[PDB]
């Protein structure tokens, strides 16, 4: 009857990066087919504040969920120990319309992006363990450690610090807008993204497109094509791979669904 | 004053019921409507056709004025064919945020919150429009809104002594009257309740006539209104049948809960479109009566009419009241 409040500790209890990685991996094709995702709604609430509404839904009974992410951006909060990005994700039953569950948007985002990048390591990191680099010690760091270790039982950039392509050992995992890689960390090899939107949102990508170092033909594919195998992952030995993630409503929905479903057994 | 939280708080419907009373919410609306209306920013709603038979609405509002530091988003789903499965068609959640820092503060059921907000807007309106010697309330409709509206009008007018509850299926009215008579609730003991099946016989009894309806059989015909009656036309989301005829608006002075009623109330729009009333002659909105810019009941013989749709500002007032009361325990 009632919707269920999933606090942050509930999220940490029920979720594991391994199982969420596998869930995303096995359901991203069908979910990307069936989920509807309108453009986001953005409102600033004051010269320094903003609200974002991100709905999504599938009304095919094979995936019966409506989701709405509500996000506040208060950047100046960072000048006072306050977090800039906050919010809640609300899940509804798409057959009856009942509110099913609500959970903290930023924690779910941590899990979502960390396991997306872990699944990307599944296709693009070479089979090498205990060799992990992490740039920054933000809240994303333990999440990304656990995800990458689940994938590869590589250097992940989640805090922002600029890494340069001349240093890198002969996989770079960029989390999404401040400089993260030099112009030609994309020189070395094949650059992959989580979805089409990255091609217009990642500052480094379209910035490298400005100066003409790479064309859009030269992008090696997105996470869906790699999962499916339509575009090949790592092919060489000491090859170059990078994966730039910006996020998508579809992965947010997959994660919210997994939380709610495995919480209710 | 007390317990704050850096987590959002889930206020259940049962929590809503033990937290709110109709009188306290009436007073909170009365004393904070002018403020909130001045400061709240409400852009156009967002509507999404989810399916040939279902839709999603998002209504955000915010005030970045620290004397009223809240952001609110009402998320509402409409699944009309749910009535075929004996399920509710209008569901959703209200999410409240701190507008100074941006943190999520509380979430609550939008449908229950709407019952409380709608009923208490009508009751507050009664304090300005119903005669203070009102003794008889006629409730047209025995649905979910009816007990709320009875309690709100009684808190508005404690001189009330008899309630007549009409419903097309009279047994629903008799059952509700029986339950309210045995209720034991304190804003309900100095009252008698009676169910009836013939609307035309009892409309003339009402010093207050409150209508929460959506059918042709529930039409309140203006000719049968008693002199000095106050007629409370309660609108609900996705309910579009006329609650009264043109004569009821012709006989009385018409007030609205806010300006949107003048374009959303089917009754008003048809009245305007046929010449029975004239828009500039509307008595005023609830904000104007509260702040004293327009007077309400002018005579003890006058017919008053109060038409309400809803407003984000009162949604926000109710959600704010629930949150702040929860934190003040």
CATH code for the domain in which residue B154 is found: 3.40.50.720
CB contact under 8 A, B73 and A53: yes
CB contact under 8 A, B46 and A43: no
Nearest in space to B304 (alpha carbons), one of B93, B132, B146, B173: B132
**CA gap B213, A4 in Å, rounded:** 32
8 Å CB contact between A189 and A260: no
Compute and round to an integer the Cα radius of gyration of chain A.
18
Helix/strand/coil (H/E/C) assignment for every residue in chain B:
CCCCCCCCEEECHHHHHHHCCHHHHHHHHHHHHHHHHHHCECCCCEEEEEECCEEEEEEEEECCCCCCCEEEEEEEEECHHHHHHCCCCEEEEEEEEECCCCCEEEEEEHHHHHHHHHHHHHHHHHHHHCCCCCCEEEEECCCCHHHHHHHHHHHHCCCCCEEEEECCCHHHHHHHHHHHHCCCCHHHCCCEEEEECCHHHHHCCCCEEEECCCCHHHCECHHHCCCCCEEEEECCCCCCCCCECHHHHHHCEEEECCCCHHHHCHHHHHHHCCCCCCCCCCCEEHHHHHHCCCCCCCCCCCCEEEEECCCHHHHHHHHHHHHHHHHCC
8 Å CB contact between B67 and B61: no
H or E element in which residue A87 lies: strand A85-93
For residue B11, what is the nearest residue in chain A, using CA coordinates?
Answer: A5
- Which of helix, strand or coil describes residue A126? coil
**CA gap A251, A54 in Å, rounded:** 12
8 Å CB contact between B87 and A96: yes
Interchain CB contact of A43 with B (< 8 Å): yes
**Between helices A249-263 and A105-124, what is the axis angle to 10°?**
110
**CA gap B287, A45 in Å, rounded:** 24
- Which of helix, strand or coil describes residue A157? strand
Q: Which residues of A touch B58 (CB under 8 A)?
A: 41, 53, 55, 68
Domain of residue B210, residue span: 114-312
Read off the DSSP letter of residue A15. -
Closest-CA distance of chain A to residue B102, Å: 6
Structure tokens at A133: 């680099």
Site of tokens 């099946």: B197
Compute and round to an integer the Cα radius of gyration of chain B.
19
Calculate the alpha carbon distances from A256 to A6, A31, B133, B239 in Å.
10, 13, 55, 33
Q: Residues of A numbered 100-119 whose beta carbons fall under 8 angstroms of chain B's beta carbons: which are they? A: 102, 104
**CA gap A147, A25 in Å, rounded:** 13
Q: How many residues does the structure list for chain B?
A: 329
Spell out the residues 6+ positions from residue B261 whose beta carbon is closer than 8 angstroms to its own: B235, B268, B307, B308, B309
8 Å CB contact between A182 and A164: yes
Strand partners of residue A5: A102
**CA gap A265, B328 in Å, rounded:** 36
Strand partners of residue B70: B98
Q: Resolution, rounded to a tenth of an Å?
A: 2.1
Site of tokens 């010690």: A137
Calculate the alpha carbon distances from A53 to A66, A149, A248, B222, B314 in Å.
13, 33, 13, 45, 21
Read off the DSSP letter of residue A39. P
**CA gap B241, B249 in Å, rounded:** 16
H or E element in which residue A102 lies: strand A99-104
């Amino acid at each position: 009857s009632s919707p269920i409040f999933i606090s942050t500790e509930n999220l940490r209890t029920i979720l594991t990066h391994q199982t969420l990685i596998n869930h995303i991996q096995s359901n991203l094709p069908k979910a990307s087919t069936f989920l509807q995702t309108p453009i986001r709604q953005h409102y600033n609430l004051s010269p320094s504040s903003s609200l974002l509404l991100m709905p999504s839904w599938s009304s095919t009974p094979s995936f019966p969920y409506i989701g709405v992410k509500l996000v506040t951006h208060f950047p100046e909060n960072s000048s006072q120990n306050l977090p800039g990005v906050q919010g809640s994700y609300v899940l509804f039953n798409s057959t009856t319309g009942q509110t099913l569950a609500s959970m903290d948007s930023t924690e779910l985002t941590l899990y979502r992006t960390s396991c997306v990048s872990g699944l990307a390591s599944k296709y693009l990191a070479r089979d090498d363990s205990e060799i992990l680099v992490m740039v920054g010690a933000g809240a994303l760091a333990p999440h990304l450690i656990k995800a990458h270790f689940s994938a590869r039982p590589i250097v992940s950039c989640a805090t922002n610090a600029l890494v340069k392509g001349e240093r890198l050992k002969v996989h770079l995992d960029l989390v999404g807008s401040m400089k993260e890689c030099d112009d030609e960390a994309l020189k070395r090899g094949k650059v992959f993204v989580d979805n089409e939107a990255a091609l217009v949102e990642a500052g480094e990508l379209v910035g490298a497109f400005e100066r003409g170092v790479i064309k859009e033909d030269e992008i090696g594919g997105n996470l869906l094509e790699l999962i499916r195998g339509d575009k090949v992952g790592r092919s060489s030995s000491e090859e170059i791979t990078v994966f730039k993630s910006v996020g998508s409503a579809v992965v947010d929905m997959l994660a919210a669904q997994f939380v709610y479903e495995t919480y209710t057994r």
